[PDB]
Design a protein around this nucleic acid. Sequence first.
RNA 1: UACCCGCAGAAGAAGCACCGGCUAACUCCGUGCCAGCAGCCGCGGUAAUACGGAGGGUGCAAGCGUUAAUCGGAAUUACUGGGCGUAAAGCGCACGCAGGCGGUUUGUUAAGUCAGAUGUGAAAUCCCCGGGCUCAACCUGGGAACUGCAUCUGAUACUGG
RNA 2: UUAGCUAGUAGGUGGGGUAACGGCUCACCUAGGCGACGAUCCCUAGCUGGUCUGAGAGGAUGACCAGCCACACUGGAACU
Lengths: 123, 129, 82, 205, 155, 80
Amino acid sequence: ATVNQLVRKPRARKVAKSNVPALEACPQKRGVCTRVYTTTPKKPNSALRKVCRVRLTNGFEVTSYIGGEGHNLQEHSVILIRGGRVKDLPGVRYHTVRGALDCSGVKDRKQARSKYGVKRPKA
Amino acid sequence: SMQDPIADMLTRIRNGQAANKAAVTMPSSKLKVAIANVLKEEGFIEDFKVEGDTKPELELTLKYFQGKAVVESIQRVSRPGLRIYKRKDELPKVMAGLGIAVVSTSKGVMTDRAARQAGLGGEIICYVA
Amino acid sequence: MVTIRLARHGAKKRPFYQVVVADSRNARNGRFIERVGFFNPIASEKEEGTRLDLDRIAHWVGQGATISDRVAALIKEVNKAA
Amino acid sequence: ARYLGPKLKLSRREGTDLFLKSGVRAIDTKCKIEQAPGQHGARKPRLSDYGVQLREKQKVRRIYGVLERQFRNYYKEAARLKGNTGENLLALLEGRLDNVVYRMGFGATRAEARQLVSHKAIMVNGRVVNIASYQVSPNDVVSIREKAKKQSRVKAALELAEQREKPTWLEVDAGKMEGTFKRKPERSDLSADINEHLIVELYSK
Amino acid sequence: ELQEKLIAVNRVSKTVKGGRIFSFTALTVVGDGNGRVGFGYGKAREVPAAIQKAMEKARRNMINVALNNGTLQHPVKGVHTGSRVFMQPASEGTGIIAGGAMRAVLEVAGVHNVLAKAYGSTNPINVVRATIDGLENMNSPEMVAAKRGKSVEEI
Amino acid sequence: KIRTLQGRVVSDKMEKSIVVAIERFVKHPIYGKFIKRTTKLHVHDENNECGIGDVVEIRECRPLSKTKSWTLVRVVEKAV
RNA sequence: UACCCGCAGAAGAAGCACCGGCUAACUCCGUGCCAGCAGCCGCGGUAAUACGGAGGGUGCAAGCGUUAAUCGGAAUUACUGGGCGUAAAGCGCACGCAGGCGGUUUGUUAAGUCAGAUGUGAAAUCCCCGGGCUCAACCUGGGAACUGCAUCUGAUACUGG
RNA sequence: UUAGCUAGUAGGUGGGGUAACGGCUCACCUAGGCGACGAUCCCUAGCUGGUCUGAGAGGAUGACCAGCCACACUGGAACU
Ligand SMILES: [K+]
Ligand SMILES: [K+]
Ligand SMILES: [K+]
Ligand SMILES: [Mg+2]
Ligand SMILES: [Mg+2]
Ligand SMILES: [Mg+2]
Ligand SMILES: [Mg+2]
Ligand SMILES: [Mg+2]
Ligand SMILES: [Mg+2]
Ligand SMILES: [Mg+2]
Ligand SMILES: [Mg+2]
Ligand SMILES: [Mg+2]
Ligand SMILES: [Mg+2]
Ligand SMILES: [Mg+2]
Ligand SMILES: [Mg+2]
Ligand SMILES: [Mg+2]
Ligand SMILES: [Mg+2]
Ligand SMILES: [Mg+2]
Ligand SMILES: [Mg+2]
Ligand SMILES: [Mg+2]
Ligand SMILES: [Mg+2]
Ligand SMILES: [Mg+2]
Ligand SMILES: [Mg+2]
Ligand SMILES: [Mg+2]
Ligand SMILES: [Mg+2]
């Protein structure tokens, strides 16, 4: 408050930390699936939600969500991950990008296709 | 302890006029006489007087219009903890020029309007609305 | 040594040249001591395609500056027109 | 670059004549102008203030035919120019070569005028120009080039423009197929139906 | 004559032995332009009834402000509860740079050119209070001169 | 006409040399309070004539030692 | 090469994301806390404008979304511009060094302060007024600015000595 | 959640050395010098004109272009 106190000790600017530290300010990262499994969400929801533990190229290991109906992922499968948490899955801070490396696009989807990695129906 | 007798004078004005006092009395001082003179010239007070030889008192007669204080506000700006000086090109305009700032220029205590006309800066004592 | 020369300051296929005084060791577009004028090869006939401060050029030559062949040509051109 | 869909749906959504068709016939014989498009368009909404501002921004773009990027560039320049940002913006939109060509009467529609420009049929100040966004300026002459005067289109367009209100800032000599900026346009002459200040509000947020 | 604005509608509730009773409140403002404005806060069990009460309250409870040919005389700071409002005059063609709750008040007052900023609580009721308080404090050269006894040439 | 500083002697224990404190008031860049700032110079003190607390006038010269690059012009006041 | 002329024929050239609220756009059919969705609030357990499909919108456009990252909004580190009875915040109390601050009067100085002059503050970039590319983006002439630094010559109200 | 650091270290006299002033270097003499206005130590980092953001004060930043600095497989040295 008092200007003499400020001169003795300036205003310490807070630092806002990144929510996605394993991404190291990269937009995406490659990684290898060491385990693929499912978990219940927390209240109020109920489901079995599909997740994988992935070792990233920088040696971080993270848990990542596998969006869309059905997937082809397996252990030793190589996938690309991006930021964005899932809420109701505590600790799942990343999304697997569909349609990149081993991760197939969703097979029969026709709307919002570019989010799920599936190509135009030509006919 | 008392360390800013100018802020003391201004606070006595503010409080006395909020209390509808007819006149207020305070310890006199050259700078107080100068500031009171400027306020009288700008019409913010009716009159001022100095009385006594060893311990001179200064009295200000306060001014009211339609039953309400003529002084709208009176605010110390330069103060012992943080002195404020302005260049000619930086003198502030109080209430877009309806109020006054009191500036101790090298030529003496005067309004900011006078200081701009003279082409001077100085120490800015207070704002009066 | 001190030299007076053109610096290419324009766009692709749209050249424009400043006339600048420089130490010859400095890069074409790099450090220069003083700017002296300009030349435009594609200015209109209605347009000022060249300007020089001939007085300061004479001053620098008095100091021993080396004029570039194209700058010399431009000076002859200006003193033929003017 | 261009909107190429059903033009009169736009007028239905705006609920007003956007001049998108040349006017050989009244639009109520060509569309259910009073009713918004689609199966739910019968249920008239209660627009929010954001909806209102958006709808005006859309209306002005959709009259003059300008996409958002170019329209925002017009906004930024009008905000740089002196005077009222909205009056400046409308003066800019009215200074376009396609708009001038339409006001002059050589195109029966703004899109027809845009073809006439783009196909190098228009000359300005004695020079061919085919850029729709070209900003015409005072004392500029505009004319049909002499190879193009053979088209029937321009003749029918002139026989329609004679029915429309005559602009005050232009002059045209229809029989010669030439005209001129006598003045720049002004807020007095452009239709009061455009709420320029809502455009200013929407981009100034 | 009067222009009218509806600023807000809010559903409040009273708990009772049987459950919850829901009631609607409406905040509105009216003004002549030309620097006369008032605000009205109405309560009812029906939205239109609340609005009508608000308007009737706002036709009385109406104050005069000495506008400077459609702008403010000087910058003003108004405060009420948690809401602090700064307003400043602006050059012609500036328009109303303000938030919705302040824009309504300044529009119905007819202040065409203003810069304004809300600080602290943006709660519409207290914001309207703070804005009216500020406009009510604003004063003009002629009555400043009358107070100080100078001629207006003092400006 | 010499561009010159004035300060006070804060050490005299070196040979032909003194430490001079220059004391300056400077407006703090951000908070605007006027802060006292100090700078210490090592100054050539020929004859060892100065003493602690003296007020002395000094000027910039050629390098004279590792630290010394300033020389005494004159004493202006003396302590005690 | 730019630019210009001639010729055939609408011929060779439109996608992406949204539509529960914030925030413009909604109705059927699947499905039944499942499968799935999400920036925040939050949707789905047999009548889902929130999932998936279709028909309608709406918004951008040779682009459209998503992830990463900075400032803003954030007066949420508050110098301009915040707080400390109960929301986070007065040391358990006191003494006291360095430090910050200083009742009143006269003289003197001219450090802070103020005024004037001179030098410097590279060009570019950024603003204003004008030129050139068929417009624009680009290029370019002149001006302003470069919120500063430094050295002289004055003023002495205030502050410091 | 680094408080003490330094012995060519700080200064002086006289030789030597440099294009040149100097502990730059050497013999001897004095015993200092720096530091809470943060020395020493640890982590990070080329600097500036500027760029982005902002009503402004500020905050972040130093890709392209221009000025200065440093480097040239790693570590030393000198020659012309
Ligand atoms: K503060
Ligand atoms: K020696
Ligand atoms: K040494
Ligand atoms: Mg449940
Ligand atoms: Mg484009
Ligand atoms: Mg708040
Ligand atoms: Mg939604
Ligand atoms: Mg259903
Ligand atoms: Mg922020
Ligand atoms: Mg801030
Ligand atoms: Mg707080
Ligand atoms: Mg408690
Ligand atoms: Mg507490
Ligand atoms: Mg206590
Ligand atoms: Mg005590
Ligand atoms: Mg003490
Ligand atoms: Mg003390
Ligand atoms: Mg005193
Ligand atoms: Mg001085
Ligand atoms: Mg050598
Ligand atoms: Mg590095
Ligand atoms: Mg801000
Ligand atoms: Mg800016
Ligand atoms: Mg590089
Ligand atoms: Mg290598």
